[PDB]
Amino acid sequence: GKIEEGKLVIWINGDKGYNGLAEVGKKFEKDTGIKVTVEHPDKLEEKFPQVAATGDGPDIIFWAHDRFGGYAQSGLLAEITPDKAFQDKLYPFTWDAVRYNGKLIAYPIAVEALSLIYNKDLLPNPPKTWEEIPALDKELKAKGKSALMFNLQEPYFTWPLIAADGGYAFKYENGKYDIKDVGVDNAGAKAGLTFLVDLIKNKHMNADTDYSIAEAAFNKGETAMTINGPWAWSNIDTSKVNYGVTVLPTFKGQPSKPFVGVLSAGINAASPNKELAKEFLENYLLTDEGLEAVNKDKPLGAVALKSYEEELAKDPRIAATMENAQKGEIMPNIPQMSAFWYAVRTAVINAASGRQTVDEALKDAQTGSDLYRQSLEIISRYLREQATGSKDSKAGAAGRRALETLRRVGDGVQRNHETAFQGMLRKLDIKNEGDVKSFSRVMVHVFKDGVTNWGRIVTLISFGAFVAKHLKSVNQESFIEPLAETITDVLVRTKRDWLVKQRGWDGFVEFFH
Numbered sequence: 001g002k003i004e005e006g007k008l009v010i011w012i013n014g015d016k017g018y019n020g021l022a023e024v025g026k027k028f029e030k031d032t033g034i035k036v037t038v039e040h041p042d043k044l045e046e047k048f049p050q051v052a053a054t055g056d057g058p059d060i061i062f063w064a065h066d067r068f069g070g071y072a073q074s075g076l077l078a079e080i081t082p083d084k085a086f087q088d089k090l091y092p093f094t095w096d097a098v099r100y101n102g103k104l105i106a107y108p109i110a111v112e113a114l115s116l117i118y119n120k121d122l123l124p125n126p127p128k129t130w131e132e133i134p135a136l137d138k139e140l141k142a143k144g145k146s147a148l149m150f151n152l153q154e155p156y157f158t159w160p161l162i163a164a165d166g167g168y169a170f171k172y173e174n175g176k177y178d179i180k181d182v183g184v185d186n187a188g189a190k191a192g193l194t195f196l197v198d199l200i201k202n203k204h205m206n207a208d209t210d211y212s213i214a215e216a217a218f219n220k221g222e223t224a225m226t227i228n229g230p231w232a233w234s235n236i237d238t239s240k241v242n243y244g245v246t247v248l249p250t251f252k253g254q255p256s257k258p259f260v261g262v263l264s265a266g267i268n269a270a271s272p273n274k275e276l277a278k279e280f281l282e283n284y285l286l287t288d289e290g291l292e293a294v295n296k297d298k299p300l301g302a303v304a305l306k307s308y309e310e311e312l313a314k315d316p317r318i319a320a321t322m323e324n325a326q327k328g329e330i331m332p333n334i335p336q337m338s339a340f341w342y343a344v345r346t347a348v349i350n351a352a353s354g355r356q357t358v359d360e361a362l363k364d365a366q367t368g369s370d371l372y373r374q375s376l377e378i379i380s381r382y383l384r385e386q387a388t389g390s391k392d393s394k395a396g397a398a399g400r401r402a403l404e405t406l407r408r409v410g411d412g413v414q415r416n417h418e419t420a421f422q423g424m425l426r427k428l429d430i431k432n433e434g435d436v437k438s439f440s441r442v443m444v445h446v447f448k449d450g451v452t453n454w455g456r457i458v459t460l461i462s463f464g465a466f467v468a469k470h471l472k473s474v475n476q477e478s479f480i481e482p483l484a485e486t487i488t489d490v491l492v493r494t495k496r497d498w499l500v501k502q503r504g505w506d507g508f509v510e511f512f513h
């Protein structure tokens with residue numbers, strides 16, 4: 001393999017207590033003799049699924065729970081095997097955050113939520129609303145300082161305000177989340193994002209302020225407030241700023257609803273040291289001495305282990321985190337969160353800068369959030385419709401116009417290049433699905449380069465329909481839907497940003513109308 005046997009390599013983000021975790025590994029090396037190396041790579045959430053799909057990466061990966069469900073869908077995680085004797089040591093909600101398809105995929109560590117952090121010496125009475133912030137900024141700017149400065153490069157810090165008046169990611173009726181209704185461009189988010197953009201335009205905040213310059217500004221006493229979670233308390237302690245942690249401001253009478261994260265530890269499915277990773281996580285990290293080693297470095301918040309939470313509950317700063325946690329909503333861990341996160345990440349940055357209006361950014365975020373879902377429905381319906389000859393009798397008329405347009409456009413194009421399609425077809429293996437799934441390699445390489453227009457996308461889907469028909473004739477019916485999956489993977493992973501600029505499939509409908 002590509003992972004060394006006899007040691008543990010752990011990936012944890014840089015804002016967390018990576019040193020405090022490293023001394024847990026020194027303790028792990030001292031009783032055990034096995035070395036434990038902890039690293040904090042940048043863009044960890046994106047680099048793990050890339051290197052783990054090729055069978056490499058760390059033994060243990062640390063991040064909030066929202067990313068693990070996608071990693072599990074991609075088969076990058078091994079099921080953790082804790083007995084109930086151990087499960088009774090952590091709170092049930094932490095276990096609930098690491099469940100996907102009924103199988104546990106990671107050990108929960110600690111519950112995070114954003115809070116308002118304010119300098120008691122620059123204002124001893126924190127404002128209870130967001131609407132009070134512009135006026136307070138004018139008074140302190142006369143004193144040479146600012147009211148609020150928080151990171152606007154990651155949408156995690158703005159979602160509390162966006163979700164205040166009715167914004168949400170994916171709706172949770174009836175048993176669980178539904179994928180079709182995304183709430184990024186509702187009247188609530190348009191109002192929440194507008195107040196932030198209005199704060200930027202009236203020069204009360206800077207649109208490209210990030211994490212480091214906002215933390216430095218607060219630690220120096222250059223701002224009266226900012227928004228971050230428990231991991232920032234450590235360096236505010238060192239700056240000796242008399243700070244407080246209180247509940248986030250309300251927006252339009254409603255509380256700010258922060259995304260609740262549960263940082264968790266998953267075990268790589270390609271790792272040869274899965275049992276030692278379990279022993280390290282069960283009998284060393286998730287113990288009171290082990291968690292205190294990490295919490296002393298950078299605070300975790302509400303620890304998952306019940307014995308250590310009973311000791312740390314008395315902290316007024318952790319109590320404030322639960323106030324914001326209860327008034328927030330838990331982040332889903334469905335595999336569609338990555339595409340949702342990138343959609344809102346671009347939308348906040350473009351609206352903050354003025355490159356897009358708030359309405360243009362949020363609608364494009366809606367297209368990007370449902371991008372993969374709606375694309376697969378149209379391509380899967382079309383390939384089935386060309387294979388059977390009938391029609392499916394299953395916020396849907398837009399797909400009906402796209403499928404009817406794809407019927408009219410795909411039929412003519414498919415018979416235009418019909419000779420070339422069969423010459424390309426003439427070969428064909430099609431022995432198993434692994435070979436049909438192996439068409440992902442060829443298609444992504446040919447499609448990353450070259451012209452991007454609707455004509456190419458139609459030609460891509462039309463040959464897929466051409467293969468689907470032949471799949472039905474060679475009695476390979478079950479291979480049609482996996483073929484559609486492959487086409488949808490290739491299409492969106494290469495042309496996502498183009499398809500968003502073209503109104504999603506609405507631009508496909510108008511292009512041919």
Ligand SMILES: Cc1cc(OCCCc2c3n(c4c(-c5c(C)nn(C)c5C)c(Cl)ccc24)CCCN(c2cc(C(=O)O)cc4c2ccn4C)C3=O)cc(C)c1Cl
Pocket residue numbers: 091092093094111260302303304309322325326327
């Ligand atoms: C208030 C509290 C929080 C806490 O915290 C321990 C850390 C984990 C935690 C729990 N709770 C949380 C809530 C939270 C709250 C609050 N309301 N709502 C709607 C949510 C989502 C939020 Cl917002 C954030 C974190 C938690 C839910 C209730 C208590 N509990 C739970 C605790 C137990 C138990 O007694 O062992 C059994 C539980 C749950 C949840 C389901 N079951 C079966 C949890 O597992 C720990 C304690 C002791 C107490 Cl008294």
Ligand SMILES: Cc1cc(OCCCc2c3n(c4c(-c5c(C)nn(C)c5C)c(Cl)ccc24)CCCN(c2cc(C(=O)O)cc4c2ccn4C)C3=O)cc(C)c1Cl
Pocket residue numbers: 424425426427428429438439441442
């Ligand atoms: C529509 C269709 C597509 C298609 O193709 C199957 C999909 C991918 C495919 C492969 N090869 C291709 C070459 C190719 C060849 C030959 N030489 N060179 C220089 C290239 C670029 C061309 Cl020109 C076009 C497509 C492919 C590369 C070598 C073999 N192989 C590979 C094969 C193996 C393996 O079996 O061991 C491992 C491989 C690769 C590529 C990377 N790895 C690890 C492929 O994955 C095949 C047919 C019959 C049809 Cl009908």
Ligand SMILES: Cc1cc(OCCCc2c3n(c4c(-c5c(C)nn(C)c5C)c(Cl)ccc24)CCCN(c2cc(C(=O)O)cc4c2ccn4C)C3=O)cc(C)c1Cl
Pocket residue numbers: 417420421422424425439442443450451453455456459460461463464467487
């Ligand atoms: C393995 C697999 C692959 C796949 O891939 C679908 C990708 C679409 C594709 C293209 N081409 C194809 C040819 C083809 C060949 C070879 N010769 N000739 C004459 C044709 C028509 C065949 Cl036989 C089948 C599919 C294609 C080459 C020319 C058109 N073109 C195009 C390429 C360019 C460009 O390079 O810039 C611009 C183009 C077009 C078409 C319009 N414009 C503007 C393409 O991108 C789909 C599936 C389901 C599977 Cl399973």
Ligand SMILES: OC[C@H]1O[C@H](O[C@H]2[C@H](O)[C@@H](O)[C@@H](O)O[C@@H]2CO)[C@H](O)[C@@H](O)[C@@H]1O
Pocket residue numbers: 013015045063064065066067112154155156157261263341345
């Ligand atoms: O901003 C999008 C980003 O939000 C969350 O990332 C948080 C992380 O969970 C926190 O523990 C801390 O590291 O701050 C991050 C934001 O900078 C999600 O976990 C992540 O998936 C998403 O991309």
